[PDB]
Amino acid sequence: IQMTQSPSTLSASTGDTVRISCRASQSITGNWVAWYQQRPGKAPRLLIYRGAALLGGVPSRFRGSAAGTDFTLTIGNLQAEDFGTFYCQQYDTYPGTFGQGTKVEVKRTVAAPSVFIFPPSDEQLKSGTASVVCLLNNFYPREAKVQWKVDNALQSGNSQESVTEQDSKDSTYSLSSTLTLSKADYEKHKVYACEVTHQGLSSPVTKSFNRG
Amino acid sequence: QIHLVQSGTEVKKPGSSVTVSCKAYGVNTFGLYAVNWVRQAPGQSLEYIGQIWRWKSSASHHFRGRVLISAVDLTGSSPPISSLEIKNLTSDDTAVYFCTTTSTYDRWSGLHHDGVMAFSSWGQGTLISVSAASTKGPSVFPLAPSSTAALGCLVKDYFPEPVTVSWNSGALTSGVHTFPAVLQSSGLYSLSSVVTVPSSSLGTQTYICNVNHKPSNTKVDKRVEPK
Amino acid sequence: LGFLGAAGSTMGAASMTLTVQARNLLSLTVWGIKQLQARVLAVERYLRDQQLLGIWGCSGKLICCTNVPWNSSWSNRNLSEIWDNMTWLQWDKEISNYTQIIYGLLEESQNQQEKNEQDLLAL
Amino acid sequence: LGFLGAAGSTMGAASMTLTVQARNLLSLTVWGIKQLQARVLAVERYLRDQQLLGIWGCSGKLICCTNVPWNSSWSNRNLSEIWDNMTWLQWDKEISNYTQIIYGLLEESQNQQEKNEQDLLAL
Amino acid sequence: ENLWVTVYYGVPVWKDAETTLFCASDAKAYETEKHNVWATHACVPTDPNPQEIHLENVTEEFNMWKNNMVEQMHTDIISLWDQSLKPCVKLTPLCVTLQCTNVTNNITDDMRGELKNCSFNMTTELRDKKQKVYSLFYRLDVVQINNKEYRLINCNTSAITQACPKVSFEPIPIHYCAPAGFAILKCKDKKFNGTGPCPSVSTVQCTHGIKPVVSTQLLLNGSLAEEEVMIRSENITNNAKNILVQFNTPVQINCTRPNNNTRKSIRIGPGQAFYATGDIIGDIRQAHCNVSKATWNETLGKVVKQLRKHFGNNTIIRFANSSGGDLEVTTHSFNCGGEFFYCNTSGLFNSTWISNNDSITLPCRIKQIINMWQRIGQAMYAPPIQGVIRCVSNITGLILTRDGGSTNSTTETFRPGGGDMRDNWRSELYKYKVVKIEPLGVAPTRCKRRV
Amino acid sequence: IRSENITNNAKNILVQFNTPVQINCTRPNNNTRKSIRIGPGQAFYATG
Ligand SMILES: *[C@@H]1O[C@H](CO)[C@@H](O[C@@H]2O[C@H](CO)[C@@H](O[C@@H]3O[C@H](CO[C@H]4O[C@H](CO[C@H]5O[C@H](CO)[C@@H](O)[C@H](O)[C@@H]5O[C@H]5O[C@H](CO)[C@@H](O)[C@H](O)[C@@H]5O)[C@@H](O)[C@H](O[C@H]5O[C@H](CO)[C@@H](O)[C@H](O)[C@@H]5O)[C@@H]4O)[C@@H](O)[C@H](O[C@H]4O[C@H](CO)[C@@H](O)[C@H](O)[C@@H]4O[C@H]4O[C@H](CO)[C@@H](O)[C@H](O)[C@@H]4O[C@H]4O[C@H](CO)[C@@H](O)[C@H](O)[C@@H]4O)[C@@H]3O)[C@H](O)[C@H]2NC(C)=O)[C@H](O)[C@H]1NC(C)=O
Ligand SMILES: *[C@@H]1O[C@H](CO)[C@@H](O[C@@H]2O[C@H](CO)[C@@H](O[C@@H]3O[C@H](CO[C@H]4O[C@H](CO)[C@@H](O)[C@H](O)[C@@H]4O)[C@@H](O)[C@H](O[C@H]4O[C@H](CO)[C@@H](O)[C@H](O)[C@@H]4O)[C@@H]3O)[C@H](O)[C@H]2NC(C)=O)[C@H](O)[C@H]1NC(C)=O
Ligand SMILES: COc1cnc(-n2cnc(C)n2)c2[nH]cc(C(=O)C(=O)N3CCN(C(=O)c4ccccc4)CC3)c12
Ligand SMILES: *[C@@H]1O[C@H](CO)[C@@H](O[C@@H]2O[C@H](CO)[C@@H](O)[C@H](O)[C@H]2NC(C)=O)[C@H](O)[C@H]1NC(C)=O
Ligand SMILES: *[C@@H]1O[C@H](CO)[C@@H](O[C@@H]2O[C@H](CO)[C@@H](O)[C@H](O)[C@H]2NC(C)=O)[C@H](O)[C@H]1NC(C)=O
Ligand SMILES: *[C@@H]1O[C@H](CO)[C@@H](O[C@@H]2O[C@H](CO)[C@@H](O)[C@H](O)[C@H]2NC(C)=O)[C@H](O)[C@H]1NC(C)=O
Ligand SMILES: *[C@@H]1O[C@H](CO)[C@@H](O[C@@H]2O[C@H](CO)[C@@H](O)[C@H](O)[C@H]2NC(C)=O)[C@H](O)[C@H]1NC(C)=O
Ligand SMILES: *[C@@H]1O[C@H](CO)[C@@H](O[C@@H]2O[C@H](CO)[C@@H](O)[C@H](O)[C@H]2NC(C)=O)[C@H](O)[C@H]1NC(C)=O
Ligand SMILES: *[C@@H]1O[C@H](CO)[C@@H](O[C@@H]2O[C@H](CO)[C@@H](O)[C@H](O)[C@H]2NC(C)=O)[C@H](O)[C@H]1NC(C)=O
Ligand SMILES: *[C@@H]1O[C@H](CO)[C@@H](O[C@@H]2O[C@H](CO)[C@@H](O)[C@H](O)[C@H]2NC(C)=O)[C@H](O)[C@H]1NC(C)=O
Ligand SMILES: *[C@@H]1O[C@H](CO)[C@@H](O[C@@H]2O[C@H](CO)[C@@H](O)[C@H](O)[C@H]2NC(C)=O)[C@H](O)[C@H]1NC(C)=O
Ligand SMILES: *[C@@H]1O[C@H](CO)[C@@H](O[C@@H]2O[C@H](CO)[C@@H](O)[C@H](O)[C@H]2NC(C)=O)[C@H](O)[C@H]1NC(C)=O
Ligand SMILES: *[C@@H]1O[C@H](CO)[C@@H](O[C@@H]2O[C@H](CO)[C@@H](O)[C@H](O)[C@H]2NC(C)=O)[C@H](O)[C@H]1NC(C)=O
Ligand SMILES: *[C@@H]1O[C@H](CO)[C@@H](O[C@@H]2O[C@H](CO)[C@@H](O)[C@H](O)[C@H]2NC(C)=O)[C@H](O)[C@H]1NC(C)=O
Ligand SMILES: *[C@@H]1O[C@H](CO)[C@@H](O)[C@H](O)[C@H]1NC(C)=O
Ligand SMILES: *[C@@H]1O[C@H](CO)[C@@H](O)[C@H](O)[C@H]1NC(C)=O
Ligand SMILES: *[C@@H]1O[C@H](CO)[C@@H](O)[C@H](O)[C@H]1NC(C)=O
Ligand SMILES: *[C@@H]1O[C@H](CO)[C@@H](O)[C@H](O)[C@H]1NC(C)=O
Ligand SMILES: *[C@@H]1O[C@H](CO)[C@@H](O)[C@H](O)[C@H]1NC(C)=O
Ligand SMILES: *[C@@H]1O[C@H](CO)[C@@H](O)[C@H](O)[C@H]1NC(C)=O
Ligand SMILES: *[C@@H]1O[C@H](CO)[C@@H](O)[C@H](O)[C@H]1NC(C)=O
Ligand SMILES: *[C@@H]1O[C@H](CO)[C@@H](O)[C@H](O)[C@H]1NC(C)=O
């Protein structure tokens, strides 16, 4: 058997009711399904077993349900401690199998990022490398892609991204893109540009810089 | 009062062997508990490895003939301890291994289904880093501002983890966004830590980032200058 | 052989030895008090499933075939992996979610062929 | 719905809900003494009408049709003013003069088709 | 393809369930009688040949420390002693001051007062007149208050109730049977340590004979391990947890009260007699238990071999005598024919073990006022036995204890210890689990009831 | 109002309020229990 959770991201605001769904390949008529909650930088945590049985000590806000092939989890009256991956396990047949995850986030409101481009460091240049970076700050709906246009030319296959966790105070994200390239090629190119496409902006804003 | 505590983070050569331990405090015996070993890949879902249920060990299909699970009972000074040994490490064996335990004493439980269990108690994490190349110092490069803006510091080609970044000897904390490290294609790591400050104060106040590195014992302090 | 001897046998092989278990379920100092509540507790517990086994119509039987289908959402197993593969304890642990549903269908379906047979007796 | 819910319903409408009442009749300090005579008094009172319901042949049934006629001097009412008009309590109060007569005819007529069926089994 | 629900009755399935077990006593009054503090008359007759059914294919799980068969036998014996001590004399009139004098004095030994000759005033017959009586008391039961004046050890904290002199104190085996619809599961494992799966289970109607003998530091007349010495502790890494050893071979212990006592009756009231000690006919000797020096030595090297399975194969294990507490926890106290001994078990636990005919006499002493154990302001006076006491029994285990310091130290000390008679019942009932049988089942069978 | 015989003076009358009336009261003295031994294993709990 293999469980299939949905949706993979289920951002919701505190104080409401939430519902994770979990459909197994075949019918589990014994209700051999448990629900685990993982928080950032911690070990998983059992909430529900045997379909909809509450493990001792868990808040009574959780409420599972079994339907043969469609098992659900209801986080009613959401607090701030119930944000994190929710895993689906089935112990009906060997071996136990997990789902894939369901990240629960906060709602707040849509924001917009503040892009900042930087040049290859002069000290870093002497090392033989000319890596360049793109940095967004304090945006939302993630869903952000960085378009690297060098000499008015698209660039791909040499960009690495890193997104930080959701902020605790403002519930805001961040992202950084870096192009790793040889020092010699850096001089050959003329103009460097970073293009960002986000739902929070009316049009794709592009901030670029000139070599030197 | 069940408290499984495991070993610490370790980096192993791609081809050596490892042994993770898990001391079970609050577990009376391993004939009344089942110890299952599950592993979480860097960004994947948890994967089940093997178990010792009635003093008879087993491993899943992937790990058969390649993993070893053992356990000893309550003895005098230490608790029941279970250890997992992985031979012939590969590049994909780096994950946060977990030690788990379920109470099998009750026969009508539902936490266990005649051989397969739900994991009621978890360890804490024994992240194993299987990688090549020797430890490298944390060379730092500056993200000098140029034309409210946000500056920062760049650290790359350092290994293994971790590195702690403090600005102005850890004085300023507001606006600091230390992005998580990203593994490169040359078996190394890099990261960027930046801070957002008002433009008018760029020249009035100096900003310095502290690059700390435990494995290499190399601590580098750098000063950034707006362009 | 013997009371509970076929406890680890598959479901099929333990259905031949029902009368061994069925004939064993009935059988003022500190000793007298606790010997007198053992007798009382053993007739009220035996009469609890005799009444239940009677609203289902299986009064004087050890195996009774009923008029309610299996619904296949209670257990979607074969008729061979259930009767030679699973012991009675395993089957009970698996079907424990729907016993209170199957039990209520067994008596609502018996006082429906008790009025249908009562209506048919007048014709 | 519920134990005794159809108490004010006519005889006809309260005969559909028999299994509600029938499944509810069984279920050393000062508290312990009076909790122990409540259990004893409730298993014997339940076995008094199980035995009675068995010498009449209606062992595992909630409605049993018998081989004794009504005699029309016990109650000369219609079959419609009895089954939709009179509640069970009214009928009991009206027919309370002849219950000990009807009860003795129900068992003398059952151990007469028990010997007739015993004689018919040899042929 | 279509299936129908069919109910089965008498299907083998059970659940753990605590219930009220009762008696079966094989040794009913065999035309001999002498009612005791226990079963005898009132316990239901036992089967001439009990039935044991070996459940094949089945692996149950036992936990000797969450057993409710022993938390129910514990209160069945506190209340068998209460119900036999309510209908006889209460020795409240004996809270007078006694004018005790040493029986020997300049007679023998160092002038030790092992026995005192106490005379006191009491109201015999009429409640006005009180005549001067006397009796022999032990030094363990008189507290000097200040030929000085004494008083009974008990009667500033507890109420004495003389044990009725017709009941017998000799334990009679008791079988704990289960009502109909319940069964007791017996672990037929020969190396069972009371916890974990037992792959060889069995079904019995009720347990074997269990003598209700209570003792401290040494389990007398118990049951022996089939193969080897067995160590059982609730938490073998906790010093506060007792350790229960079980000998595969008994160690015989003989001991006596060689003084030919004589019971005498004192009238404490109308229709109430106090059974004191008149005198001693012959030499005044000391009580003592005897244990073979070689048999104890080899049986104590079997214990240290198993203690090395939990405390490292290479460690020095030394036994020491009990540290402190009541006279019943610091001494091996038992009850030999209605007489309560408190033997000094310091010559037994005086060893030290490193990793690679003669007798031992233990000076017991007698007590006559006995307090109840898990504590109450209550006591029992045991009337003297007229004659010479001589009983022999088997040591079948120990109740040990560890002391803190096993964090840096490379040695283990094992003081003996008792005082909790709940650890007396679970050295016998450790292998028994009570289950309840659920006989109704449903299953699809493709039957169909004929309409 | 409920009485067995509302025309009999020897019959009590039982009133029942629809809304409770709260009644607070206290023993404001900070007493202290002390034990007196009236016999062997018997204590009389007097006021010190
Ligand atoms: C109350 O009473 C109870 C009843 O008496 C009592 O219970 C007894 O408890 C003791 C423990 O105290 C039990 O003994 C332990 O049993 C453990 C279980 O071992 C089982 O499994 C292993 C492994 O089997 C796999 O591999 C083999 C092939 O190698 C296959 O054949 C197996 O089928 C299985 O293979 C599957 O699984 C693999 C994954 O593991 C897959 O890869 C594979 O594809 C398959 O899917 C078996 O070897 C064992 O068999 C042995 O015993 C049987 C019967 O005796 C023999 O016939 C057989 O030949 C073997 O000898 C068994 O089936 C053991 O793991 C455990 O062993 C540890 O401790 C002992 C000493 O105590 C050491 O000798 C041993 O080396 C282990 O020590 C290591 O591990 C501990 C714990 O982590 C470490 O602390 C220690 O430092 C050491 O680490 C070293 O070794 C590591 C390798 O393991 C290495 O990686 C490390 O780096 C390091 O160097 C021990 O033997 C005993 O069985 C119980 N008795 C009963 C009847 O149940 C209970 O204790 C009492 N209560 C109290 C409180 O005392
Ligand atoms: C561990 O288990 C052993 C054996 O199970 C016990 O040994 C028994 O100890 C008791 C107490 O001393 C013995 O009972 C006493 O026996 C005395 C001598 O026995 C003679 O009489 C019996 C019975 O006729 C014969 O079988 C035997 O061969 C001897 O000829 C008696 O003199 C005692 O009698 C006094 O007490 C009884 C009962 O109270 C009165 O009726 C008498 O009038 C008299 O006052 C007493 O009967 C018993 O015989 C021993 N059995 C064995 C097999 O040796 C251990 O005591 C026990 N230890 C512990 C700590 O529990
Ligand atoms: C002697 O202890 C009581 C004293 N007095 C009373 N009562 C007085 N009045 C009333 C109503 N009860 C008692 N009731 C129950 C009592 C007990 O079971 C009880 O504690 N033990 C009985 C078994 N045992 C011994 O053999 C013993 C064994 C080895 C060494 C020393 C003594 C231990 C203690 C009890
Ligand atoms: C199947 O049955 C089991 C037990 O028969 C159910 O587990 C219980 O679930 C409730 C729900 O809150 C808990 O309160 C109980 O504690 C659980 N059992 C026990 C013994 O504690 C299980 O929920 C059932 N399956 C489904 C899908 O409802
Ligand atoms: C048995 O006793 C030991 C103490 O000797 C207990 O072990 C401790 O458990 C607590 C609970 O988490 C830990 O914080 C301590 O570090 C442990 N100490 C040692 C020395 O192990 C153990 O929990 C007890 N067993 C049970 C089942 O309660
Ligand atoms: C205990 O003391 C009493 C005295 O109260 C002793 O009784 C006296 O014994 C002597 C010698 O046998 C007699 O001459 C007296 O007549 C006795 N007096 C009474 C009042 O009995 C008794 O012998 C002493 N017992 C022991 C064992 O020393
Ligand atoms: C028992 O009571 C008698 C009195 O009935 C006590 O004897 C008296 O002791 C006092 C001591 O001061 C003398 O003054 C009296 O003259 C004595 N009376 C006599 C001898 O008749 C005797 O001490 C008491 N014994 C006890 C309490 O053990
Ligand atoms: C003390 O132990 C011995 C065993 O050494 C007991 O004698 C055995 O008793 C059993 C039955 O109780 C017999 O099957 C053995 O054949 C006997 N063996 C020997 C050597 O006699 C003796 O009964 C025990 N005494 C007690 C418990 O008081
Ligand atoms: C203990 O002392 C009593 C005396 O009270 C002894 O009983 C006497 O025994 C002798 C011979 O055995 C008889 O001649 C006497 O008539 C007996 N007297 C009484 C009052 O019975 C008893 O034998 C002594 N016991 C032991 C073991 O020496
Ligand atoms: C305990 O007493 C028994 C007898 O009650 C002693 O057993 C005797 O042992 C000797 C060995 O020297 C044998 O010759 C005898 O035949 C045995 N007698 C019986 C009746 O068996 C035993 O030796 C005593 N043990 C101790 C330690 O005193
Ligand atoms: C256990 O044995 C030790 C020594 O064998 C005894 O220790 C004595 O304790 C007393 C305190 O009451 C000291 O005054 C002595 O000096 C100690 N003797 C030695 C040699 O150190 C201890 O009393 C014994 N305890 C028991 C219960 O047997
Ligand atoms: C029990 O026996 C031991 C030894 O047989 C006694 O230990 C003696 O204790 C005193 C002081 O406590 C020491 O002066 C002696 O030297 C000890 N004797 C030995 C041989 O070591 C102990 O007193 C006896 N009684 C108790 C209650 O422990
Ligand atoms: C424990 O045993 C040891 C030796 O086995 C005893 O040591 C004694 O120490 C005294 C010291 O004054 C010597 O006079 C004795 O000769 C020693 N005994 C032997 C047999 O040599 C120690 O007394 C014993 N302790 C107890 C409480 O019995
Ligand atoms: C009643 O009096 C008792 C004194 O018997 C008070 O208890 C004392 O409280 C003070 C502070 O509250 C402490 O410092 C003392 O140590 C306490 N003494 C004892 C013996 O407990 C008690 O607080 C008083 N209660 C009230 C309500 O005033
Ligand atoms: C069968 O079981 C399902 C599960 O709840 C139920 O909805 C349905 O009414 C039952 N009957 C039939 C005929 O499927
Ligand atoms: C059920 O029985 C049929 C009959 O041949 C068989 O083909 C099928 O494999 C069985 N199913 C299982 C799961 O064993
Ligand atoms: C009582 O009378 C009302 C009014 O006709 C009727 O609806 C109701 O059914 C009667 N009682 C019962 C139990 O039906
Ligand atoms: C009895 O039923 C018949 C059937 O039609 C009817 O004609 C007659 O009036 C009824 N009698 C009474 C008393 O209602
Ligand atoms: C127990 O399991 C074995 C394993 O082959 C089997 O042969 C045996 O039949 C089982 N027990 C019973 C009573 O059938
Ligand atoms: C009895 O002997 C003890 C032993 O020390 C002594 O203290 C006491 O004074 C003696 N009493 C009499 C009355 O001789
Ligand atoms: C016998 O006792 C001595 C010390 O008294 C000890 O050294 C020896 O090991 C013992 N022998 C056995 C076989 O235990
Ligand atoms: C004996 O010593 C070995 C040391 O290799 C240890 O592993 C073992 O637990 C000890 N006890 C035994 C083998 O019973």
Numbering used by the authors:
A (entry chain D): 2 to 30, 30A, 31 to 212
B (entry chain C): 1 to 35, 35A, 36 to 52, 54 to 77, 77A, 77B, 77C, 77D, ...
C (entry chain B), D (entry chain F): 520 to 546, 568 to 663
E (entry chain A): 32 to 140, 149 to 185, 188 to 309, 312 to 321, 321A, 322 to 398, 411 to 505
F (entry chain E): 272 to 309, 312 to 321
What did the authors write?
The HIV-1 entry inhibitor temsavir prevents the viral receptor CD4 (cluster of differentiation 4) from interacting with the envelope glycoprotein (Env) and blocks its conformational changes. Structural studies involving temsavir and related analogs indicate that these compounds bind to Env within a conserved binding pocket that partially overlaps the CD4 binding site, i.e. utilizing the pocket where Phe43 of CD4 is normally inserted (referred to as the Phe43 cavity). By binding within the interface between the nascent bridging sheet and the gp120 inner domain, temsavir stabilizes the closed Env conformation and prevents CD4-induced conformational rearrangements of the inner domain layers that lead to the formation of the bridging sheet which is necessary for coreceptor binding. To allow for an unbiased analysis of the structural changes induced by the LMHS mutations and/or the binding of temsavir, we determined each structure with the same set of chaperone antibody Fabs from the 8ANC195 and 10–1074 bnAbs.
The only other temsavir bound-BG505 SOSIP.664 complex was solved by X-Ray crystallography using the chaperone Fabs of PGT122 and 35022 (PDB: 5U7O13). In the core region, two hydrogen bonds are formed between pocket residues Asp113 and Trp427 to the pyridine and the oxoacetyl group of temsavir, respectively, and are present in both structures. In BG505, the threonine side chain at position 202 blocks the path for the extension of the BMS-626529 ‘tail’ toward the β13 sheet while a larger but more flexible lysine side chain allows the methyltriazole ring to adopt conformation with its methyl group ‘up’. At this point, it is important to note that there is a significant difference between the opening angles for the temsavir bound-BG505 SOSIP.664 trimers whose structures were determined by different methods.
